[PDB]
Design a protein around this ligand. Sequence first.
Ligand SMILES: *[C@@H]1O[C@H](CO)[C@@H](O)[C@H](O)[C@H]1NC(C)=O
Length: 108
Amino acid sequence: QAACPESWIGFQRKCFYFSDDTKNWTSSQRFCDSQDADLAQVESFQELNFLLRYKGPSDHWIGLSREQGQPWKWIGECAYLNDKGASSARCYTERKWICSKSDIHVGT
Ligand SMILES: *[C@@H]1O[C@H](CO)[C@@H](O)[C@H](O)[C@H]1NC(C)=O
């Protein structure tokens, strides 16, 4: 059994932080790096669906990016979630973001 910090939201073993403000992709990653977290690393389809359902009507950066000629990689272009799925934009644009981290295990 497990918990998330109070401003974060839990979904199966992970915690996610949905931002108030907008940043570019690198400055969102810097922000998440502070929480010893990362721009959201979506490990499963169920997790993607969760973020799509929870996120609200704004675009949100996730931790997926691409150097030109090269494939998309999880932590050029950067990916965000819109209402239907993922899309790309230049990394200098300003969007809300999602951080992810493993949840806090509460030992017994
Ligand atoms: C993102 O914006 C920040 C301002 O917080 C700036 O320091 C950084 O260089 C920017 N990165 C870009 C424009 O790619």
